[PDB]
Amino acid sequence: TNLCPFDEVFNATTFASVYAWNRKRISNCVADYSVLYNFAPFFAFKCYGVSPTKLNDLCFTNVYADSFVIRGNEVSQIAPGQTGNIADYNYKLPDDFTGCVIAWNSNKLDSKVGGNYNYRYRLFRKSNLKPFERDISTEIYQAGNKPCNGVAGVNCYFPLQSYGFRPTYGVGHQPYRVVVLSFELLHAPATVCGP
Amino acid sequence: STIEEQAKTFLDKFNHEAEDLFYQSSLASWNYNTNITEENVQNMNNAGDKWSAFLKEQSTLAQMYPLQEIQNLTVKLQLQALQQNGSSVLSEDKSKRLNTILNTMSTIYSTGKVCNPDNPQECLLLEPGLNEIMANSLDYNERLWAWESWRSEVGKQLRPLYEEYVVLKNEMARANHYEDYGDYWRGDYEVNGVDGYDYSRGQLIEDVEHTFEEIKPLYEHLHAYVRAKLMNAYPSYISPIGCLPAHLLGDMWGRFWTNLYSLTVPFGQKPNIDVTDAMVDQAWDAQRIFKEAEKFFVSVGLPNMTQGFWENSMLTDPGNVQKAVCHPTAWDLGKGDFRILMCTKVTMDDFLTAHHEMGHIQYDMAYAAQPFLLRNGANEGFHEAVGEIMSLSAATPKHLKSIGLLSPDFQEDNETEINFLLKQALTIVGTLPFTYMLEKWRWMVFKGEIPKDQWMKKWWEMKREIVGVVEPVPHDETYCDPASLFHVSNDYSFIRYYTRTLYQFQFQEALCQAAKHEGPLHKCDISNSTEAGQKLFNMLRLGKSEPWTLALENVVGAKNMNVRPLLNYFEPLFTWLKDQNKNSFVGWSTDWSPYA
Ligand SMILES: *[C@@H]1O[C@H](CO[C@@H]2O[C@@H](C)[C@@H](O)[C@@H](O)[C@@H]2O)[C@@H](O[C@@H]2O[C@H](CO)[C@@H](O)[C@H](O)[C@H]2NC(C)=O)[C@H](O)[C@H]1NC(C)=O
Ligand SMILES: *[C@@H]1O[C@H](CO)[C@@H](O[C@@H]2O[C@H](CO)[C@@H](O)[C@H](O)[C@H]2NC(C)=O)[C@H](O)[C@H]1NC(C)=O
Ligand SMILES: *[C@@H]1O[C@H](CO)[C@@H](O)[C@H](O)[C@H]1NC(C)=O
Ligand SMILES: *[C@@H]1O[C@H](CO)[C@@H](O)[C@H](O)[C@H]1NC(C)=O
Ligand SMILES: *[C@@H]1O[C@H](CO)[C@@H](O)[C@H](O)[C@H]1NC(C)=O
Ligand SMILES: *[C@@H]1O[C@H](CO)[C@@H](O)[C@H](O)[C@H]1NC(C)=O
Ligand SMILES: *[C@@H]1O[C@H](CO)[C@@H](O)[C@H](O)[C@H]1NC(C)=O
Ligand SMILES: [Zn+2]
């Protein structure tokens, strides 16, 4: 039996940034839900449309796992119907989103003395994004009524900004590794489910 | 693309960079204050230089969004803070001269060294030395020698620099669209734009004088009592109807009358409440003190403190291996970081200082959600007010009885209440006239109502008339007595102490009324009261986002600073003083002088 590899997403050495998050599909395998209940300190295990205990055995078509890390007081925006910097310009979830969100502290792994400036998010955008839409553009955001021609200056700002995580930060500014799951059903026969 | 959106986006960037830069600077300063070394001082200096350069660059770039076309009243204050020119608007030579003058004055004050006229080398500085003489000595001549020497070998060297400093600061203030430096200083209390909560910069003087007028009778009675009890220690140096000499006030400048309790005690045979022995005989440490104060804060509804406080904060002297500055301060590094630096000992004074610093930390945690520029008190007299009101409740006998440091069968007599009230009055009521007089003199000098040749004359006339203190030796136009104080040699304000003293008792009275307390206000404990905690937290969370008038009304229900709650605090002491002063004279005569 080929078990669903729910062991590389939760145990990766490095995680992606908020503005460019990884998405690895899981299919053609029997799913388990015990290798996920470990790592006892879990900041949030909320689910929408499904129950955690009921999630033991259901048949679906494809499972998507998205990997990124934000600060402590931003997990609240990984929920449907939320507005903010991470919801508008980084990751939007639909109002009919079905799945669960898992968040846990990662201060030991993702913090360095002197700062960790390898994790970046988008600050300003000209508009918003539809659900499940990414944008890796690095153009200059124009805050005025003249074009900057691609160089920072007056009314010209660099969009991305580093987090600068440090081990001495508070619980709201500490890094928090977040994994979301989306369950979809198609006309194809259901195969991705365990015994 | 209106100006409002350009200001909004610019403020967002500025905040997101300022958090990181200020965190770096604060961490460097904290490391220096814990580790006194050369590498850490170099790192702190580098971080401070980077922060100052970034602040100057952003302030220069933020001047292009005029205030007249922005209507939100919350981005108004951020842009007002960022657009302050300060010394920047000046020629390079003038700014260099101003900085040189300030550095020279600070160095002269810090490296002040007077020498006794008997042997050339045993000279004493201010701290220690002269302070110990002026605090713990009863000799008339030694105190006079110290008082005159400090103002003759330090103040004489500050007047030529102070004149040029006044001229340059006045020119800068006028160039910054003000009328004088005093108005620039008063600008902190200014409120403009909000209907019904406005406060002109000129209204400050009127309110201060109006409050001092009602202060006057209690201070007169306390002055008479202190003079009556000071004639016993100095039989042939004080007139029964005259003014108090300036070198017998227990302090170098007469700022506080605290050191006079040994001579002006009402009932000497009855000791004050001291729980140091009970603290020692119950195996108490710094951790227990801070846990008890945290429990007291949780008792009123305020939350626990972060897990990071207990690990990253130092509460004891490291030892001889390390060197740290033993000064109790509350640190808000930002980004969820809260630390307290204190060399805690097993003492009641440290027990109350812990409550003070935790009140500071609670205030800092209250407005953590505000933008960076608004993360401060409502005005310059709000943080210390919270500290005092948080420390006042901890010294009540019932609070000490509830936590086990007082015997359950300890009856409180009304004599100890009088002793405690006199102790409080010697340090709270005896400083308001001094602060008011100093600030009024500085304001009038900045305005120009006092010409350069009448500085000392006006200063001593005001001290004789308002405070009730007379110089022991005549002073001509070469001395600069105001410059001898730390807050004048170094550029700092002084009205904040008066304003905070008047706010703290308003806050205490409001909270005690909200706690359904019955009896005198000086016997009030706000423990086990959620209503007082909510009432305080309603104002604590605003920060600078609202005018201080609204913040004050959110707690006390009054639109303006008052003096009635303070007089209610000292009502039993006032009645006792009136009874004891029936055979004496209340008031003073300006004419009498010790050298007359
Ligand atoms: C603050 O209150 C606590 C708890 O007291 C309880 O709650 C009150 C609202 C009131 O209803 C009391 O009657 C309750 O007992 C006090 O802690 C108690 O103190 C008494 C001393 O008489 C002691 O016998 C209890 O064991 C304590 N309970 C504990 C520690 O859980 C505390 O003393 C009060 N603080 C004051 C009055 O300053
Ligand atoms: C701070 O100083 C700068 C100049 O150093 C001021 O900018 C000038 O202000 C005057 C005032 O009318 C204008 O005429 C100029 O056009 C401005 N620019 C320059 C380059 O001179 C600035 O206004 C000052 N800040 C405040 C709040 O007054
Ligand atoms: C996660 O990674 C750590 C680091 O090697 C490892 O010790 C742990 O066993 C891993 N857990 C799982 C469930 O893979
Ligand atoms: C800084 O303090 C720590 C321990 O508190 C230790 O590394 C050392 O005493 C100090 N560092 C240096 C470089 O002196
Ligand atoms: C002021 O700006 C803030 C920040 O966007 C906004 O939330 C608020 O609504 C503005 N004030 C008014 C009255 O719209
Ligand atoms: C504060 O901490 C104590 C002990 O750690 C705990 O009993 C109490 O519930 C905490 N208060 C809150 C509001 O979490
Ligand atoms: C204290 O109470 C006693 C008892 O009535 C009373 O005689 C006395 O006047 C009161 N005041 C003082 C200052 O002792
Ligand atoms: Zn304080």
Numbering used by the authors:
A (entry chain B): 333 to 527
B (entry chain A): 19 to 614
Q: What do the study's own words say?
A:
Receptor binding and immune escape have been recognized as two major drivers for the evolution of receptor-binding domain (RBD) of the viral spike (S) protein, which is responsible for receptor recognition. Receptor binding is a key step for SARS-CoV-2 infection. In this study, we evaluated the binding properties of BF.7, BQ.1, BQ.1.1, XBB and XBB.1.5 RBDs to human ACE2 (hACE2) and determined the cryo-EM structures of hACE2 in complex with BF.7, BQ.1, BQ.1.1, XBB and XBB.1.5 RBDs, respectively. As previously reported, the binding interface of SARS-CoV-2 RBD in complex with ACE2 was divided into two patches.
The phylogenetic analysis showed that BF.7 could evolve from BA.5 and gained an extra R346T substitution. The R346 site is a mutation hotspot, and previous studies showed that it plays pivotal roles in immune escape and receptor binding. Pseudovirus entry assay indicated that all Omicron sub-variants have enhanced entry capacities compared to PT. Notably, BF.7, XBB and XBB.1.5 have a higher entry efficiency than BA.5 sub-variant, which was previously the dominant strain worldwide. BQ.1 (KD = 19.07 ± 4.08 nM), BQ.1.1 (KD = 14.70 ± 0.37 nM) and BF.7 (KD = 13.37 ± 0.29 nM) S proteins to hACE2 are comparable to that of BA.4/5 (KD = 14.37 ± 0.41 nM). Based on the ACE2/RBD structures of these sub-variants and a comparison with the known complex structures, we found that R346T substitution in the RBD enhanced ACE2 binding upon an interaction with the residue R493, but not Q493, via a mechanism involving long-range conformation changes. From the structures, we found that it is R493 but not Q493 that is regulated by R346T substitution through long-range conformation alterations. The residues participating in H-bonds and salt bridges contacts in the RBD of the five complex structures are all conserved as expected. In all the five cryo-EM complex structures, hACE2 H34 possesses two structural conformations. The H-bonds and salt bridges interaction network in patch 2 of all these five cryo-EM complex structures are extremely similar. Though the side chain of V486 is shorter than that of F486, V486 is also a hydrophobic amino acid that can interact with the hydrophobic amino acids, L79 and M82, in the hACE2 through van der Waals force (VDW).
